[PDB]
Amino acid sequence: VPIQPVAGAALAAPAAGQINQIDPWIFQNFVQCPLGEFSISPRNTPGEILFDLALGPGLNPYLAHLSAMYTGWVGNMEVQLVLAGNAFTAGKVVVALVPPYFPKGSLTTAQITCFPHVMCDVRTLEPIQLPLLDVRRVLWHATQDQEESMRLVCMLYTPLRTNSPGDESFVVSGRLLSKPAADFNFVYLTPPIERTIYRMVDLPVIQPRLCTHARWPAPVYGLLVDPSLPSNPQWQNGRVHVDGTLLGTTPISGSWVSCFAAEAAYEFQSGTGEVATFTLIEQDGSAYVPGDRAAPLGYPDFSGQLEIEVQTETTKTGDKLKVTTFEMILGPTTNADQAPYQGRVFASVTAAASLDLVDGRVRAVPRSIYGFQDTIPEYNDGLLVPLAPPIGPFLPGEVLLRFRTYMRQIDTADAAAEAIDCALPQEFVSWFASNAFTVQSEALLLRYRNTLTGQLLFECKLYNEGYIALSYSGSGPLTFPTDGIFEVVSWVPRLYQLASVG
Amino acid sequence: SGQDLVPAAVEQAVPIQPVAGAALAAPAAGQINQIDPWIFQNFVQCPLGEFSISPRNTPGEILFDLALGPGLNPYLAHLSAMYTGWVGNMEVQLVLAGNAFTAGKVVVALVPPYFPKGSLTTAQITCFPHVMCDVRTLEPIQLPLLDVRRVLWHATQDQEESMRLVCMLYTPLRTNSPGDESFVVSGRLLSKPAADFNFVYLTPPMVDLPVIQPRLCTHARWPAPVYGLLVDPSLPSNPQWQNGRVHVDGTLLGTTPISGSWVSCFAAEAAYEFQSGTGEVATFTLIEQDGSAYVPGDRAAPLGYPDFSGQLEIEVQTETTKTGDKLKVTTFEMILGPTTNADQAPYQGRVFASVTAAASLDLVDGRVRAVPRSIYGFQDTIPEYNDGLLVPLAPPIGPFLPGEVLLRFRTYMRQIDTADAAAEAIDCALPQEFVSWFASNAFTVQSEALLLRYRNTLTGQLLFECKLYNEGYIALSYSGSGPLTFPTDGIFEVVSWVPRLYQLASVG
Amino acid sequence: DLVPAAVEQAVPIQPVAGAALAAPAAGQINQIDPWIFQNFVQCPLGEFSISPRNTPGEILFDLALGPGLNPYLAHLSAMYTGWVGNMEVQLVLAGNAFTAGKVVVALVPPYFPKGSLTTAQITCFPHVMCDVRTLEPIQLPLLDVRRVLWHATQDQEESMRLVCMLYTPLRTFVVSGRLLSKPAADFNFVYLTPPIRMVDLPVIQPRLCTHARWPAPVYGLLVDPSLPSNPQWQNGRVHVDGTLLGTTPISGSWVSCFAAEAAYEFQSGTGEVATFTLIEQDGSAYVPGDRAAPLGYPDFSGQLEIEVQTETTKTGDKLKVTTFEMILGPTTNADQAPYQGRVFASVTAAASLDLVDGRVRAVPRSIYGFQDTIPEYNDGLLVPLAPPIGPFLPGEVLLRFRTYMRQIDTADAAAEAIDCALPQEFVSWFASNAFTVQSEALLLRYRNTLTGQLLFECKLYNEGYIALSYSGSGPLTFPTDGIFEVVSWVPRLYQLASVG
C-alpha cells in the first residue's frame, strides 16, 4: 500500500512521562475484533460496506483491558482479513485505509480505490495482512476518550458468482483479526478505573420470575413473543436506552410504576360524589413542569377506569386517617378533562355527601382497572404530546419479546386477567441507568440460558433503543420458561441475522 | 489463490514504440507543473470504469472505449479543471477475474487517433495493436495507453482526438456449470498516470444527485408530493409523457417546466361569455406563465401544461362586475382529450372551458392563471393538442433492454368520481427537484447510462442498482408480474458511467 | 553611525516547520504544483471596503490561515485530509489622493482570546502600517504557528489569524480592498483521499421561480421601505449551510398546504365542520417540538379556502373535491391549533353532506381579508418561532420577492401581493448542497443574462435573505430575467453601492 511508516512511541517518548511496554505474548496472537465479521452473499450489491473498524485499543480485548490502567496509548497495529470461500467463487473486496478527519457514511465503489487499499479475491488462501497505522496529529492518544484515528474500511468490490445449492445459499464469511505492531505501547500508569473505559455490557444475574414488571406494579409472570399483538407499541413506561438514557415517563424505582403523587383538593358535587382535583408533582417531593415527556415520572401509559388509593385525612369525628378508593378515567377520550401533561388531573368517587377530606399531599397507587386498553392515555385533553417513539424497527423475521404480568381487573362478566406487557423489566432499566455503559454498535447479542441445565434456550438481540428481538417466524404466541439468565455475548451490528426458534 | 484452473497472466507484447509524454511539451509550456508522486503510486478506479459481460452479449459488442485523457482517473479528472493542457501516457489494468466455470475472450485494442470512431467490427479489432484476454484471468491485465499525437499537448477543454483503448467481446460468454443461471463477469478498469504524464498551465477552476428523500419531492406531472416508489408491470413500457422529461445535461423536452408550481397549470387571457344551455364559457388565449406570450414552437402546449387526459377542473381568478363581489375564484370544468367536441387546441394557444351556470356571471375578461382542482374520468394518455391533428412531441420513455423496466414515482390526484372511491395514481419518471437540478447544473455526459444506487442512509441497506440513461429515465432489472414497492426514506447516488449493455442485478 | 529615518516595513519572523514536524505521523506528505507558489490569487473571502462611516477600531477583514485562502489550495484540498505550512498574503487598497487613513494588518496568533481588539492592542502583534493611498500591494507572511502536527481540512480549528482594522479614521467615498494569497515556500497537504464546494447558485431567472410562502410563480422583484423591514416570516427561511428556520419545507408542492385526518360532522347554522388532525405531509406523523407547525403550514392570516378530497355516501356521487372555509389568524374563534396538531374548518351547508372521515391533503384555493402577519398557533400561546429577519446596516433595506395570490374579495380588484425573502429553489439548493459557510455575507451581482446589464450588487447574509444598499423610501421594481452569481464572501461591515 502507498503509505509512509508512522512513528509511534518514538514521537511520543519526549512529552510522555512513562512509555509502558506490554506483555510480549500479546504481540504473538491474533485476536478477533469484536465487530469485524461479515458474510458476502450473492445477493449483495457491490458498494456495500462490509466493515468499518477504527484503530484503537478496543480492537484487541487485551489492549482494551490494559488501557484502563494507562493515561494514553500510541502506535500501529497488524490486521488479518480471513475469507472463508473456496475455488468456484469469483468476487473481490477492497480494504481501504481511511485517514482520520475524513467524513463518514456513503462511500461509492470508485471512491474506495482512491485510498491506500488492497483488492483481494474471495479465493485467497492465506489471510490478507494489513498495516493499520497511527496517522495522528497528536503525540499520543488519551485512552479515556476516542478521537479520530485511522479507520479500516472493507466493502464488496465485485459481486459473488457462485452456484448455491437449493437448501441453503452459499456465503463467503470473513473475519478480521488483529494484534499490536512492535511499535504500540501505552503512556502513563494510572489507577485502574474500572467504571467506564471499554467495559463490556453485562446484565444482572436475575431470573425473570424474580423481576418486576415496568408498566404495572406486579411481578413478571410471562416471557413470550406474540406477532398477533401490535409489533410497534408506543409505550412510555419501561423505556430505557442501553447507555442509560431514560425515555418517556420511565422512572428509576419500581415503586413509582403506574402511580402518581399530587396535591389533592377535595370538593363535593351532587350526583357525582366527591371529586378530587390533583395537582401533580414528582414523586420524590419535587414539582412537575411540562417538558420533554408526556407526564410525570411513573404516570400510567394506558387507558381505562383506574381505581386509585389515597391516604385521606378527614375532619369528621371518629376517624383521622384512612385509605380511600377513588375512580379516575384515563383515556383515550375522556370528558373529565384529564391533563397529566399540564400536571392537573381529576378523580371522583360516588359519595352521597361531602367526605370532608383535608386538602393535602397524597401518593395515589393503583387498585384495579376497568376496561383496559393497550394504547396511549389522554395527556393534554386530546392534544398529542412529546412521546417516546414506537418500539422498532425490526428486521423481517424478528419479533418483539414481551414481559407479561396480570392486572387486577374490575369485570362483571369475564375472569380472565388483563395481561399487560412491557419491553424490559424494571431491574434492567435501573441496571442500564445506574451503569451508563458505553455503546459501540447497534445491537447486543444476548443468550437466554437456563441456569442449572445449561440449555441454551434462545439467542436474541438487544437494541440500543431498549427492546429485545427474537428470530421467530411463527404466528402464534410462544411462551418461554422464566428460570434462565440473559447473558451478553458481544456487540453485533443491526443487520446481523439470528438463528430461528420455535 | 484457491485455484490454478484459470489463466494467471497475459502477455504484453503489444507492437508499439514508446511515446514521449511531457518532455516534448515542456519547452512550449510556459510553466513548471507537476502532479504529486503519490497519484503515480496507485491504481484507482474512475466512475466510468465498470462493465459487465453477459451471455446475451453477442461478439463484436464494445465493452469499453477509453479515450486517453485526464478523465480516466478521478485524481487527474479533478486536477484537469485547473489546467489548459495535458500530455502523457496512461497505464490501465483490466480486472475481469471470471468464475472457473466460464469461457470467453475479449480483445482490447489500441485504436490510433483519427480513426472513424464506430463501427469497429471483429474483423477490424485485431488489425490494431491488441491483446486477447480470457475472462477468467486471475491477476489484473495491465495495459499501456500511449499518447500518439501530432501536437505537443492537448487542450483539456477540447475533446480532442487521442488514442482510444477499445475492448469488444471477442468470443461469447458461456458457462459449463450444471443447471442454474449463467454467470456474468463484472470487470473493472483501473488507471494511473505513467511516468511522464503532466499538465500544462494553471487556470481558474462532475455529476451528482441532490440529497432529497423521495417523500420530500414534488411530482412533475401533478402538483402533489410523491407518495410511492415502485415499478408496475401491468402498465405499458413506453409512455409519451411530456412533463418531467429532462435530460442529464438539462435539455427540457416538450412542455417541461422548471418551477414546481407550474405543473398542470396554464396562464392565459380569458374571454368570458355566457351561453344558454351550457353556462359560463371562457376562451383562453394561451400565453406563458412568466408574463410572456405563447409561441407554437418545438412543443405542443405552454410549459407546465398537463400531459394526461380527462375532465380537469381549474381555479380561475375572476373579477366580476356584480354588486357585493369584486374578486372571486371560480371553478371551470374542462374536458381535455384525446377527441373532444369543444375544440381543445393548446398547440395554437387557444383552449375552452365551461361551468354550468343558470345566469351570466359577468366576469371581466383578462389575464388569469388556472391551477388544477380535480379530475373526472382520468386517462394517462395524450390530450387533444391540435384539434386531433399531429403535433411535435417528446419521444416515448425508452428503449429498454429485455428485462429493464421503468421505475415509476407515484402520487395521488384529487378526483371527482361518482362510482369509484380510489384516487388516481399518476406516475412520473423523475420529480420536479431533479428537473430543476438538471436544468440548473448542466452536467456533462461520458457514456449513455448512469448506474445509480438507492441507499436508505439511516439504515444502510443498499436496495438495488439502476441505470439512468442520458435521456433522463431510470430503469431497473425486474422480472416479477406484480408491482413491487420500495421505501421513500432513501437516497439515490451516482455510482458510475455505464453503457447500454450493463447487466443489472435483477430484483424481485 | 546614521540611523535612517526611512526604513521599509518588513515583518521579522522565526521560520516555522511544516512537513518536518508532520511527516513521521502524517501518513503521506503531498507536494503541490510548484507554480502555485508563484502567483498571488484572490481569496474567495477577499473583498472588503472602508468608508467614512467606519470608526477606528472596526475590524475590516478577519482571515484564517489555511487552504481555503487560495482557490488552487481550496480546490486541491478536496482530495486531501490535511495540510500544513505557511502562506503569504497581499493586500490591495484602492484609494485616491484625497483620502487619509491608516489601516493595520496584524498576525493574531491562535488561542488568543479573540473577543475585542481595541486600537492600541492591534500594534502589539506582528503587523504592518498601511496607508490607504498606497499604489502598490502590501505583502505579509502567514505562518503556521500551531501546537498540532498538521491540520484537518474538514475541521477549521484555530490557526493563525490575519486581522485588519481601521487605525486612523478614513477622512476626506468607499475605498475597496482586496486580499490576494499564495502559499509560501513550505506548504504540503496530508494524505490523498477521494475528492468529496465553493458557493454557487441555481441559474434560475426570478420569474421562473416558485414562491416559498404561496404556491405561485414569482412575478415581482422589488424593495419596499414602506413595508415593515424585519418580518417574522416562518417559511422560506434557510441558512447558507442548509439549516432550515421556521416551518420551511423542501418540496414546492408543500407550500401553504396541510395533510391531516379529517373528521366530518354537521352543525346547524354553520354547515359541515371538519376536524383536521395534522400529520407530516410526506406520509409520516407529526410531533410538537422546536418548530411552530408541520412543514408547509400557511404562515399568514385571513380566511383561507381549502380544497379537500371528500368521499360521500350519497347516491349519484362517490368522490368529490369540496371547498372549505378556514380562518387562520391573527385571533380566531374556530380553535386553530397547528402547533399541537388539531385545527378546524367549516363550510356553509343546508344539510349534512355525509362525508367519510379519513386522510386528506388540503391545498389553498383563495384568501379573504389577507394580512401579512402570523396566525394563531397554540390558541394564542407562544410557540418556538423563527427569529425576525435582520439586522440591517444603516443604509440598506430588505429585498422582497413578490407573487400574486388568488383572492375572493367583495370590493377591491387588486390582488394581494405576498413577498418572501427567498423562493423555494434557493431553499432546496442551499439545503441539499450544504456548503461550508466561510464568512458572514455573500456578495452577489444581479446581472442580465443575454445583454450583460449589471443592475445591483447585494449582500446575501447567512440568515437567508438579501439586503440592498438603498437610500430612497419608495418601491422599485427590477426586471426578472437576470441571474445572481457569487462574487465572494464579504464581511458584515462591507459597504455596498447605493441604488435608486
Residue numbers in the entry:
A (entry chain C): 30 to 531
B (entry chain B): 17 to 221, 229 to 531
C (entry chain A): 20 to 191, 199 to 222, 228 to 531
What text does the study give?
We used cryo-electron microscopy (cryo-EM) to determine the structure of wtMNV at 3.1-Å resolution. wtMNV was cultivated in RAW264.7 cells, then purified by ultracentrifugation through a sucrose cushion and 2 sucrose gradients before being applied to lacey carbon grids and vitrified. The P domains from AB-type dimers (surrounding the icosahedral 5-fold axes) are rotated approximately 100° clockwise relative to their position in the published structure, whilst the P domains from CC-type dimers (at icosahedral 2-fold axes) are rotated approximately 75° anticlockwise. The P domains are also located much closer to the shell of S domains (separated by approximately 6 Å rather than approximately 16 Å). Interestingly, the positioning and orientation of the P domains in our map of apo MNV are closer (although not identical) to recent structures of bile-complexed MNV, despite the lack of bile salts. The quality of the data allowed us to build a hybrid atomic model for VP1. The resolution in the S domain was sufficient to allow confident building of most residues up to the flexible linker region. As expected, the flexible linker connecting the S and P domains was not resolved for A- or B-type VP1. However, the flexible linker for C-type VP1 was resolved, suggesting it is less mobile than the A- or B-type conformer, which correlates with the improved resolution of C-type P domains. Most of the C-type VP1 N-terminal region is disordered (residues 1–29), whereas A- and B-type VP1 N-terminal regions are better resolved (missing residues 1–19 and 1–16, respectively) and have distinct conformations. Using focussed 3D classification, we identified a remarkable diversity in P domain dimer positioning that was not coordinated over the capsid surface and was not equal between different quasiconformers, with CC-type dimers being less mobile than AB-type dimers.
As members of the Caliciviridae family, norovirus virions consist of an approximately 7.5-kb positive-sense single-stranded RNA genome linked at its 5′ end to a viral protein (VPg). This genomic RNA is enclosed within a nonenveloped, T = 3 capsid approximately 40 nm in diameter. The capsid is formed from 90 dimers of the major structural protein, VP1, in one of three quasiequivalent conformational states: A-type VP1 proteins make up the icosahedral 5-fold axes and form AB dimers with B-type VP1 proteins, whereas C-type VP1 proteins form CC dimers at 2-fold axes. Each VP1 monomer comprises an N-terminal region, a shell (S) domain, and a protruding (P) domain (subdivided into proximal [P1] and distal [P2] subdomains). P domains extend outward from this shell and mediate interactions with receptor molecules and cofactors such as bile salts.
